[PDB]
């Protein structure tokens, strides 16, 4: 009941994928 | 080798195993390099045996060996037979220098 799981996904952009193009 | 002066033989106490010669060096005495009248099998020492090294010709030590190596009659009369392991260690000046010029 505190947290579902301590881990969980993100679905957020890292600066690495955008950066390499620019 | 008789004509190629830089190469250094082994000359250790021969064990029980027979040297081998590639198709190209086949039928040659390892001392005088003569194609005629063999007499006795060669016998090389342990430390020339072991793994990949044992298979390679005992003259060029590059190509893989197939036939046994014999001493010629004349080298068994002189006694150069029983000096030691008749196996060439280094590849020598001639073989290298061909190699690099070609590429």
């Amino acid at each position: 009941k505190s947290q579902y799981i301590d881990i969980m996904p993100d679905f957020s952009p890292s600066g690495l994928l955008e950066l390499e193009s620019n | 080798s008789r004509h190629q002066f830089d190469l250094i033989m082994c000359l250790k106490q021969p064990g029980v195993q027979t040297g081998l010669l590639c198709e190209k060096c086949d039928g040659k005495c390892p001392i005088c390099d003569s194609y005629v009248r063999p007499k006795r099998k060669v016998r090389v020492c342990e430390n020339c045996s072991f793994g990949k090294q044992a298979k390679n010709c005992i003259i060029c030590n590059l190509n893989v060996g197939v036939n046994d190596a014999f001493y010629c009659w004349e080298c068994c009369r002189l006694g150069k037979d029983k000096d030691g392991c008749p196996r060439i260690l280094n590849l020598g000046s001639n073989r290298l220098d061909r190699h690099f010029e070609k590429k």
Binding site: - | Q13, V16, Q17, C45, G79, D83
Partner: protein
Amino acid sequence: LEAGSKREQSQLCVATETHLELYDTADGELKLIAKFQNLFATITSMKSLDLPHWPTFLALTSDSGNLSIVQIIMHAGALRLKTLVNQPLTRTTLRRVSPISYMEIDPNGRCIILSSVEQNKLCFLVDYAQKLRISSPLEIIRPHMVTLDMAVVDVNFNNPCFVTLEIDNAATQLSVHLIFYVLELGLNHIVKKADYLVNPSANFVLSLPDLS
């Protein structure tokens, strides 16, 4: 010979440089069985090797620097002297460096051991299979030491040992010292265990079995 099945250790082979002969016993009286063909070499040692698992075949080193293990055998109608292994060692003549003249055999048949006078001593490690097989030799070279009396220690399968009386060739005074060697089967090399300096008069060595 003459018996379908009989095995008895009573029988003896006797050699002299060129010549070789075979006698029998057990009749109480030494009989000649065979005289073999003419050898044409100089036999510098002869010792029976009896190896476990089989007749016995006399191991014979000579001039020619060959260790020659020969089995006397019955073929055609008469006894012949048939060879099994002749391993090359040094050169042909009777010469001081060459390892003949002392040949003593592990009492169980695990290994032959040879020496010279001076320089080297070799040890070949015998095995039997579908065909008799010798190992590559085991060398020890002590450079200035002339050797006298190589006699050999029995052992119960531990590790074959042997004892020599060596005297040094280059020294100011005569010192002749007794020196034990142990072939170590595990690492496969001959080790020098104990070395004791004894008075110069020393003449010969002999092995006392067990003391148990």
